[PDB]
């Protein structure tokens, strides 16, 4: 019932072996204490007892001068990436540019490349959806917006905020290592494993310089990603403001038209009150007149028109 | 009538003893002046006369190379935590990973763990309530929102702001110690209590390194908590914007429908004015006609329909 | 007609003497140039020619190793504070914890304590007013808010912004001194006045350490005050957002009810148009029928009900 | 056709001479290359070949150990300031406090004083206008705001933003010089012009100290100005929020009153439909009844009142 | 099928030659590895193996002590700039002020000048469009805004945000080089290509000083551009707020007028209900009266006027 790790091991030749190992046995083999392998912090890079420990969300890796270990990889869809790219990248002529360099350089480059590719894929998925939703929402010919698109935009905005947080954490973790030279020196595990051998093995090539160059490359890539995400957020905010203004303008137009119709209706009712009063069954001295009916009707209609025009002019003066 | 402290003392063996002591007697025993134990600042960590003084809101602790003291603990529901975890953690094989290290390491680790657990519990309580309230509020099928949920959201937002302030203060206090090596050296109270003994007692193990590792661990945990809180705040703001847009859209739809009905009513009244005028009790030359009544009624109805259709077309053209 | 200062002098024994002195005479006595005592900057702390010059808004003080001077104190309600606390604090067993330390320590502590008490009093006055105003304004059962409370809230917000600016300036002034050790060394005026005497007078006590401790204490107090003010501002903003949402929801509810009533009125007018048409004084072939009147009335009422129900169903479908 | 400068020269005696000089001749006389005198950057202070070059928007100055030059001064209303203050300030007992110091101190002090006075005048002009406009706009007894005041407020806000940018640039330029001691040493042009002479001429007075004091003074003044501008901006934002809330409340009140009147009108029309139906010219069996007319009228009126009261109660229950 | 570069080469004499070269051949000739010429990062300036590599969006350049290379220039409208300015600038008396300096100074100055001119042109294009659109939108005499101008403003705001991001990146890239002296020393490729020759060739002129001056110039220009862009953004936000307030005020005015007309209509209908009731065909005891008709009509009209005036007074009291 002892806790165990599902370990995938890649040697210097690219060979891959998957098995399970007890936690205590792994601690004894790697020469590390338990507190080293807690993996409590997301996106942490550390060097303990000449071994590199890396965590990136769901990816947990341990780098040694002899081999690389991936821990707790199941149910993450990582099998395709592992078994189709890592043997080629570590022990081949793939996209890695650190082949003459020791193994740890290739391992770190592969891990950083995988994470940066994941982030780039997330952003490339997010961008078109947000762009098309914003384009649909800011259509000026729509009286009211579609609420399903609003919900979709809210979900995409939450996803974008999470992605931006991930990018910021990735940048900070790299920059912290880059700032201090001691960490860069510690990262060269092969050099410090056998210092006597590498004192003469290194043919004038500076391992710290190579590590700094690689980390600077990946930091710049992450910075570009962060800039793109920030621009997307700003665009979302501007589109929201434009939507608000459009809705207000539509409301104003509808209100003005309704007001004009109300003025017309009020004038019509006011001048029909005369006919209503004449319609009651009471005695009067105007029944005998012949032209009185047409005269009253004409006065009613002409006065309705004149008062409506006067009211419209008053409204125009008020609204300037 | 002299002021006193309610002191809970844990020795190196985990034994717990609770009593009361006069302030002057405590000052004399600990070798500290009164100004040292004012506890004026919330979340302060200091080292005075080779003794550590810590305050975290309602928790006041003094760490010595021989024992630990908790001050003013009553009416805080801390008795359960104290008497059920501290004897086990300090003098056992619990979650602490600093058992071979001196006592102050275990004490600091226990206090930091308790505070970080409190913060994590607060956040884990807050998150589902805010999430479900936001999900209920952004329902697009609701014409108007529920105000009780609004009040609940306001209270939860205030609580979240307070929690974020607490996390920021906790991060700053730790980072200030971590920046300077002198404070880290001072924190090793056991080493400086008997420097001659620990000059040879330390079997190549660096106490400052262990202190730095522990503080870095807790700082990273606090940073993760702060990131989660910030993401929650951003989500709240986005949900508020979505709610505003939804309310505006509903208002626009209702206004448009009301306008259309107003146009219909105005047309009906305008064409009924003809019947009202014909209804007055005045003489006319059109009474003898037979088909005039049906002709007038048909003209009224057909014209009402035509003018309503024309007005609707005008509205559609205006709103595009 | 020469410009003069109203000077209040406190000696090392706490005795207080108030008088007036010409500016040139004061410059000659204190050994300072005119440009030193311009007091142009609010909240400035400086050391010139072994004399400390301090300004905090309306408070102007000069600290010397022998005595303290307060300048331009009239018409500021400071007489009570001066004559009731300063003689006790400077030459007594009051709240000051720097009695064995030289005079300048007591003077600086008293001035900083007075300013921090003023800021705390301002915040403690401001907080309940804003809290109760916000509680009154966010009442969900009010159709519209009270504008007098809005004006009160605006005034209180302006006051809070001014207080926050004052706290920020106070923090910055202290932190600038705390950052550099040269300023801390200069602040010990008694030590540098007679360096030969204090070379042996100091019995192993570090004046710079005491000054650093005092300044750190007051900086922490100011930081706590700033945190409280920022939390209050955030609460105000959240309450404003909640008020906006409540007003929008009330408007939507009223608009929906008005729309339903408009639909009912339109249906009633449409079906009463039939009676209006039948009411005109024109010949027809339906007068002889007996049950035609009740039949028309029943059709009118039943159709009004049916069309109103259909319109309400249409509105419900539109609003989902 | 060679480009020329309109040069105003002030000697150490305050004498002023205005003329024009070719650019190449000026370069040869001042011992500077062309690229030095491009004046491309607004608010730049530099030292080249032991000569100080300063630009502040429209003011271009060159300071030498022997004299000061102002370049391109025409059509700027600077003639009054130049010919009425500079001869007095440079060679008199005016507001300058650096008379015993060399000429460059007086020149720099005069230029900085002029610029800070310009900024203070701009702020003192801006503040009352914005304050009175905001006071007029936030009047709670106004149903709608005045749009001309809105335009005035917009113009004043743009001016305030420009002024704040100018203050920030002025602060940054001074702080950059203050941070590095090399620039402060370079600024003492008189000392470096004849180092052998000033090696013994300086009677224990530190020129760098005086320069630091002067620059710190002007930096503090600029900081105070920036704080005032920021407070004004915050006040403007708060006033805008209050205006929004007031407008929303007025709209809600008007909408509620309109709704109540609509309910009354609908009830009246509904109960008048009965009279309209009775008014048609159709046969019925209720004509012979005497009290039927008064009975119908009384039922109509009483029912109108009762249904209006019921509807108002329903509205009150809905709005709570 | 090997990948190739379209290379434009400028020698020290300004002669230009365009051709194509395989990537491997270019790597071998320039003495650089493949990873050096990936050009993955936008706006990157680096020095590798005594060769400068620069990328600015679509511009890719390699600077050597002997010649300059532009890579992948087709389909970018850069042919005009290249063939009409670069031969003159590099080998002539043009705007460059670094003619006596080595070739790399002229090359870097030309590239930086081109980029800063591009940014200035973009801003000068953007500013008038945004200014005129904002002026048109904030017209207080317009009841509703024009939505096409809103779309134009949204597009221009997106363009401005992109431009501001570009300016920020350009500033950061320059400042990073300016901060460290090692990079400035590395930038002097001619000095390090033949250190023995330039140890005596340099006649007391400091190449690092010249590089620092040039980079500081361009950094200041970029800072001015960034300030202008930020001011434009602030102006846009203020204009949006003013537009919101104007729309709200117009809505309030229209609503008030509609409410007054509704009150009048309700009064008219209420007092016409009397005539409607009198109009029904039912027996009554008031037919014989003569003056009853005129009396009822006069009471109806006078009461309508009085109740309308009372209602208007009530509305005025409610709105204060
Ligand atoms: Cl509205």
From Swiss-Prot, chains A, B, C, D, E:
Which key words tag this protein in UniProt? Ion transport, Magnesium, Membrane, Metal-binding, Mitochondrion, Mitochondrion inner membrane, Transit peptide, Transmembrane, Transmembrane helix, Transport
For the motif GMN motif, give the residue ranges.
279-281
Q: Where do the annotations place Mg(2+) 1 binding?
A: 162, 165-166, 231
Q: Does the keyword Magnesium apply?
A: yes
Q: Which residues lie on this side of the membrane: Mitochondrial intermembrane?
A: 279-289
Membrane topology label: Multi-pass membrane protein
GO process terms (BP): lactate metabolic process; mitochondrial magnesium ion transmembrane transport; transmembrane transport
Q: GO CC terms for this protein?
A: mitochondrial inner membrane; mitochondrion
User: Where are the bilayer-spanning segments?
Assistant: 259-278, 290-320
Binding-site list for Mg(2+) 2: 248
Q: What is known of its domains?
A: The GMN motif acts as an ion selectivity filter.
> What's this protein's function?
Magnesium transporter that mediates the influx of magnesium into the mitochondrial matrix and regulates magnesium metabolism. Also permeable to calcium, sodium and potassium ions. Required for normal expression of the mitochondrial respiratory complex I subunits. May play a role in maintaining the inner mitochondrial membrane potential.
Complex formation: Homopentamer.
Q: Which family does it belong to?
A: Belongs to the CorA metal ion transporter (MIT) (TC 1.A.35) family.
Q: What is this protein called?
A: Magnesium transporter MRS2 homolog, mitochondrial
Species this protein is from: Homo sapiens (Human)
Q: Which residues of the full protein are shown?
A: 82 to 401 of 443
